[PDB]
């Protein structure tokens, strides 16, 4: 009494470059598989094709490793329920509009460098007392970080943004801009104006046209579109 589910997965081997990207179908018996797409991916690699390649680490949707495009949408494979409709084949692709290293593994190095470029760390005008006492932060000011600090940098949002597809070389993208906002409103950070000044150009922030794919696709339920709108408001009113 098995329940055979079909998965069509994107394949490309850097060591046999000439073979064009193709889709490969795998049949998986759901009665002998965990409930998430990552469970099926690991089951396939362990029992059907150990050449199938993908990133993964935590199994509970906290590390950000397994981001990919499943059934048209970017999401984390480890928290994405397999669709039990056996008449439908689930298509799995790498995160969109990215350079493929192999199979489902994209090159995220530009993404990390953009993240580095916004200095995601606490900066105070005088750091010489660092390490001596706890900095004070009110409950109300701490609450402003809710919805921003939970980002796991999976890149599901940025790689779902049409603007990031066309201008990912210069547009920082939703994940990075939201982390920039996170440091802008941290009450303990003293470089808000400078953080805002960094976005005074046509691309970094301004390629965002409020398409809102980013917020729709976030596996953590966050809202980078809203965060980007808050930056635009600060950019328009700061001195």
């Amino acid at each position: 009494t098995s329940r055979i589910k079909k998965f069509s997965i994107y394949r490309w081997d850097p060591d046999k470059p000439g073979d064009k990207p193709r889709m490969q179908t795998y049949e998986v018996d759901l009665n002998k598989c965990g409930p998430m797409v990552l469970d099926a991916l690991i089951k396939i690699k362990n029992e059907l094709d150990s050449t199938l390649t993908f990133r993964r680490s935590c199994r509970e949707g906290i590390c950000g490793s397994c981001a990919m495009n499943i059934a048209g949408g970017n999401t984390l494979a480890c928290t994405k329920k397999i669709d039990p409709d056996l008449s439908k084949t689930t298509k799995i692709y790498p995160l969109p509009h990215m350079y493929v290293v192999k199979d489902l593994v994209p090159d995220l190095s530009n993404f990390y460098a953009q993240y580095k470029s916004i200095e995601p760390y606490l900066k105070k005008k005088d750091e010489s007392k660092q390490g001596k006492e706890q900095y004070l932060q009110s409950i109300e000011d701490r609450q402003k970080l809710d919805g921003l600090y939970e980002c796991i940098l999976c890149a599901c949002c940025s790689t779902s943004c049409p603007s990031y597809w066309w201008n990912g070389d210069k547009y920082l993208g939703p994940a990075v801009l939201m982390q920039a906002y996170r440091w802008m409103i941290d009450s303990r950070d003293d470089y808000t104006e400078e953080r805002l000044a960094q976005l005074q150009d046509p691309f970094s922030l301004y390629r965002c046209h409020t398409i809102m794919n980013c917020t729709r696709t976030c596996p953590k339920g966050l809202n980078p579109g809203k965060a980007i709108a808050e930056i635009k408001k600060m950019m328009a009113t700061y001195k």
């Binding site: 850097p14 362990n46 680490s57 509970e60 906290i62 590390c63 760390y121 606490l122 932060q137 796991i152």
Partner: protein, 613 residues
């Protein structure tokens, strides 16, 4: 070889690992002026540390008055006297400073009404040297403390010139004359071999929970650093001490933080009874992990388990105000819904004891230096350091206290750096290695790449995981341990028959997972052989055939007139394990536990006593 392109690097220091410990050691070295390399098989923020929840311990005194010596005491007792008191002393005393540093880096700790760091209750911590009730010293970022600690440390590391080699898999140490001179590794993105030469090497590779069938651990916790030490002929320590966390979610295995119990949640069985009131009258659901896990296991054995298979119990949070669940435990609220379909404001979470953390690892002194033990004396291994879950300082002895691991990472990650800086100078000449150094790592790598045997990697790994799960679990016994030992020994010999399929070199995860299997197996062998030899029950190691803890004296009676037992006749000592890698033969030796603190006058040694919660 000649077939693999080899790239050589020269650094003052090399750190293997980018978790909380590796990152803290790495930028700590860079901030001291050392030209440092951080080699990691994963992008940093993907490390297991990112999954930590509950918090990090420090006697800051933000909730009620505290004292670090009380935390010292809780950790010594929690370790069931297998912990080295000089290291525990260093760790608890340095704790307040360590947490303040992280917050000053911007870690978004939850806050109190005074604007200070919010601290919660956690298992096995008290005030007044165990006489004054529950301490509240677990600092946290709601229930995503690990995630915030790691992302904060990663952002900080971005301020230094540390050179990162991301997605590079370390294969072995470059040893010469009993001294470590670097590491050799594989660059997963392009298939090349690299040798990192350095006067000092820091191993911060994490644990090996993946040797088990069910664990809260990441797929990437494969004990790679512990295996490199074993292959260099050095000893590992106390590997038989495996921590089972009381609450991994039923099925998936995902951790449900002990912060749940710290905030008021309770464990109940199928009769609705809050059974810890019976196993630990005083501590209840905040007793030490070894005790809660064993208690839950007895409830299940005795028929009071829940679910259609009566194989787990319940964690109840619905009697708590929903605003507290949303503010203190938002992370597990989501996880419970995603993996068990549970709404915590209405129903309990199904939970069960699950392999979670390794107390043993590479033996080090309290300065982070790796040691060996020759002719009854501990001896430092020149140029080799270890910190984090991969090391055995040993601050946790036979049982780690919740929230002391994240503390351990930043404290000893920092200590390794300090120790190297007060020992060497940046720029000093880089030690030499023979031109073919590391060739046997490359040959083994080539052997697995083209393996065409009869037992595929996933088959042998599953065999290993099932053996460990059913032969070295919460309760153990001599005959089951022995059958497990023979089973593992056979599985180890059968690695000669491995079969892989991917013949590529770029991102060949079929190959990398076979290397991780060799590492896992060396860790597992030592764990189970060490367990079979330890004929006593201490902390997490419970023998139903040897139920008592066996010390140099019977500390349950007056010492007056007692005859001290010879070293070879008691068990209050660390197990040192070695493996002959070609045969798989395990050899066991022992070294004494360190009872002296760093200053008897400021923090006095805690002699062994009956341990109860």
């Amino acid at each position: 070889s000649t077939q693999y392109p080899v790239v050589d690097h020269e650094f003052d220091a090399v750190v293997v690992g980018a978790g909380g410990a590796g990152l803290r050691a790495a930028f700590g070295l860079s901030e001291a002026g050392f030209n440092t390399a951080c080699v990691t098989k994963l992008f940093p923020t993907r490390s297991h540390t990112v999954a930590a929840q509950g918090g990090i311990n420090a006697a800051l005194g933000n909730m009620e008055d505290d004292n670090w010596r009380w935390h010292f005491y809780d950790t010594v007792k929690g370790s069931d006297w297998l912990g080295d008191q000089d290291a525990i002393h260093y760790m608890t005393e340095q704790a307040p400073a360590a947490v303040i540093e992280l917050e000053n880096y911007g870690m978004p700790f939850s806050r109190t009404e005074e604007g200070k760091i919010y601290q919660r209750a956690f298992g096995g911590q008290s005030l007044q040297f165990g006489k004054g009730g529950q301490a509240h010293r677990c600092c946290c970022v709601a229930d995503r403390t690990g995630h915030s600690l790691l992302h904060t440390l990663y952002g900080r590391s971005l301020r230094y010139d540390t050179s990162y080699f991301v997605e590079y898999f370390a294969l072995d140490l470059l040893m010469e004359n009993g001294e470590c001179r670097g590491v050799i590794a594989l660059c997963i993105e392009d298939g090349t071999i690299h040798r990192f030469r350095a006067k000092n090497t820091v191993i911060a590779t994490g644990g090996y929970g993946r040797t088990y069938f069910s664990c809260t651990s990441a797929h990437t916790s494969t004990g790679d650093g512990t295996a490199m030490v074993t292959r260099a002929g050095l000893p590992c320590q106390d590997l038989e001490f495996v921590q089972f966390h009381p609450t991994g979610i039923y099925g998936a295995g995902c951790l449900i933080t002990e912060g749940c119990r710290g905030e008021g949640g309770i464990l109940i069985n199928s009769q609705g009874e809050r059974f810890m009131e019976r196993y630990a009258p005083v501590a209840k659901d905040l007793a030490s992990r070894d005790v809660v896990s064993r208690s839950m296991t007895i409830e299940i054995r005795e028929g009071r388990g829940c679910g259609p298979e009566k194989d787990h119990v319940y964690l109840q949070l619905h009697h708590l105000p929903p605003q507290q669940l949303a503010t203190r435990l938002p992370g597990i609220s989501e996880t419970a819904m995603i993996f068990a379909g549970v709404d915590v404001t209405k129903e309990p979470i199904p939970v069960l004891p699950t392999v979670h953390y390794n107390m043993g690892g590479i033996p080090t002194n309290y300065k982070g230096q790796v040691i060996t033990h020759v002719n009854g004396e501990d001896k430092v291994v020149p140029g080799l350091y270890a910190c984090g879950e991969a090391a055995s300082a040993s601050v946790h002895g036979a049982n780690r206290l919740g929230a002391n691991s994240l503390l351990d990472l930043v404290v000893f990650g920092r200590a390794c750096a300090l120790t190297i800086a007060e020992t060497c100078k940046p720029g000093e000449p880089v030690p030499s290695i023979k031109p073919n150094a590391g060739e046997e790592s490359v040959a083994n790598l080539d052997k697995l790449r083209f393996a065409d045997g009869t037992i595929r990697t996933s088959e042998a790994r599953l065999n290993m995981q099932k053996t460990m799960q059913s032969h070295a679990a919460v309760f153990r016994t001599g005959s089951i341990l022995q059958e497990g030992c023979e089973k593992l020994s056979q599985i180890y010999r059968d690695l000669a028959h491995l079969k892989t399929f991917d013949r590529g070199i770029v991102w060949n995860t079929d190959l990398v997972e076979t290397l991780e299997l060799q590492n896992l197996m060396l860790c597992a062998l030592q764990t189970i052989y060490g367990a079979e030899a330890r004929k006593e029950s201490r902390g997490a190691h419970a023998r139903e055939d040897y139920k008592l803890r066996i010390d140099e004296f019977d500390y349950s009676k007056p010492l007056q007139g007692q005859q001290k037992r010879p070293f070879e006749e008691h068990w209050r000592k660390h197990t040192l394990s070695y493996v002959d890698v070609k045969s798989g033969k395990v050899t066991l030796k022992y070294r004494p536990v360190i009872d002296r603190t760093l200053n008897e006058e400021d923090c006095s040694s805690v002699p062994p006593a009956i341990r109860s919660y």
